[PDB]
Amino acid sequence: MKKDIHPKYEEITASCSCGNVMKIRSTVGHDLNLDVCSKCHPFFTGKQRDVATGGRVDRFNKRFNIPGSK
Amino acid sequence: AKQSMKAREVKRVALADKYFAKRAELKAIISDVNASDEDRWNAVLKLQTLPRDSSPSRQRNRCRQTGRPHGFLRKFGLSRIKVREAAMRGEIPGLKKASW
């Protein structure tokens, strides 16, 4: 330890945590490396047969719809 | 102006009415939310290929009799200029103008 230009005993050694949350984090990690990816594609037409989450009313084997209801 | 654009258009309108009228809930079965893992499959697109060559979505309700591109009026069977020519000559019932 130097004394002729450095203070003796430091008080910059504080806390057992230095975890960031109120600012920037996980930009390439936060303890050890991360790097994420994104896959979405236009709609979820990823298959020849889908389910519907906005309409769940049962399929009629009819051939008329708007013109079927007079 | 061409006969080829009138010839395409005339055949599309009689078969749009033939083919799509009896295939109007097929539209619901293969696109709309009326299916929910039910069909949604190749077996009904086996049938929607008929209303395709001749269907409302290719029949701009125009040029089935007259050789004027756009401004058509499906209610007269005519276009801008031929509506005016027939009014001039009185060949339309009730044709006057608004004065109010």
From Swiss-Prot, chain A:
<keyword id="KW-0694">RNA-binding</keyword>
<keyword id="KW-0007">Acetylation</keyword>
<dbReference type="GO" id="GO:1904689">
    <property type="term" value="P:negative regulation of cytoplasmic translational initiation"/>
</dbReference>
<dbReference type="GO" id="GO:0005829">
    <property type="term" value="C:cytosol"/>
</dbReference>
<dbReference type="InterPro" id="IPR027491">
    <property type="entry name" value="Ribosomal_bL31_A"/>
</dbReference>
<feature type="binding site">
    <location>
        <position position="16"/>
    </location>
    <ligand>
        <name>Zn(2+)</name>
    </ligand>
</feature>
<dbReference type="InterPro" id="IPR002150">
    <property type="entry name" value="Ribosomal_bL31"/>
</dbReference>
<dbReference type="GO" id="GO:0002181">
    <property type="term" value="P:cytoplasmic translation"/>
</dbReference>
<dbReference type="GO" id="GO:0003735">
    <property type="term" value="F:structural constituent of ribosome"/>
</dbReference>
<dbReference type="InterPro" id="IPR034704">
    <property type="entry name" value="Ribosomal_bL28/bL31-like_sf"/>
</dbReference>
<keyword id="KW-0687">Ribonucleoprotein</keyword>
<comment type="subunit">
    <text>Part of the 50S ribosomal subunit.</text>
</comment>
<dbReference type="InterPro" id="IPR042105">
    <property type="entry name" value="Ribosomal_bL31_sf"/>
</dbReference>
<comment type="function">
    <text>Binds the 23S rRNA.</text>
</comment>
<dbReference type="GO" id="GO:0022625">
    <property type="term" value="C:cytosolic large ribosomal subunit"/>
</dbReference>
<dbReference type="GO" id="GO:0019843">
    <property type="term" value="F:rRNA binding"/>
</dbReference>
<dbReference type="GO" id="GO:0005737">
    <property type="term" value="C:cytoplasm"/>
</dbReference>
<feature type="modified residue" description="N6-acetyllysine">
    <location>
        <position position="8"/>
    </location>
</feature>
<comment type="similarity">
    <text>Belongs to the bacterial ribosomal protein bL31 family. Type A subfamily.</text>
</comment>
<keyword id="KW-0862">Zinc</keyword>
<dbReference type="GO" id="GO:0006413">
    <property type="term" value="P:translational initiation"/>
</dbReference>
<dbReference type="Pfam" id="PF01197">
    <property type="entry name" value="Ribosomal_L31"/>
</dbReference>
From Swiss-Prot, chain B:
<keyword id="KW-0689">Ribosomal protein</keyword>
<comment type="similarity">
    <text>Belongs to the universal ribosomal protein uS14 family.</text>
</comment>
<dbReference type="InterPro" id="IPR018271">
    <property type="entry name" value="Ribosomal_uS14_CS"/>
</dbReference>
<dbReference type="GO" id="GO:0000049">
    <property type="term" value="F:tRNA binding"/>
</dbReference>
<keyword id="KW-0687">Ribonucleoprotein</keyword>
<dbReference type="GO" id="GO:0015935">
    <property type="term" value="C:small ribosomal subunit"/>
</dbReference>
<dbReference type="Pfam" id="PF00253">
    <property type="entry name" value="Ribosomal_S14"/>
</dbReference>
<dbReference type="InterPro" id="IPR001209">
    <property type="entry name" value="Ribosomal_uS14"/>
</dbReference>
<dbReference type="GO" id="GO:0002181">
    <property type="term" value="P:cytoplasmic translation"/>
</dbReference>
<comment type="function">
    <text>Binds 16S rRNA, required for the assembly of 30S particles and may also be responsible for determining the conformation of the 16S rRNA at the A site.</text>
</comment>
<dbReference type="GO" id="GO:0000028">
    <property type="term" value="P:ribosomal small subunit assembly"/>
</dbReference>
<dbReference type="GO" id="GO:0003735">
    <property type="term" value="F:structural constituent of ribosome"/>
</dbReference>
<dbReference type="GO" id="GO:0022627">
    <property type="term" value="C:cytosolic small ribosomal subunit"/>
</dbReference>
<comment type="subunit">
    <text>Part of the 30S ribosomal subunit. Contacts proteins S3 and S10.</text>
</comment>
<dbReference type="GO" id="GO:0005737">
    <property type="term" value="C:cytoplasm"/>
</dbReference>
<dbReference type="GO" id="GO:0019843">
    <property type="term" value="F:rRNA binding"/>
</dbReference>
<protein>
    <recommendedName>
        <fullName>Small ribosomal subunit protein uS14</fullName>
    </recommendedName>
</protein>
<dbReference type="GO" id="GO:0006412">
    <property type="term" value="P:translation"/>
</dbReference>
<dbReference type="InterPro" id="IPR023036">
    <property type="entry name" value="Ribosomal_uS14_bac/plastid"/>
</dbReference>
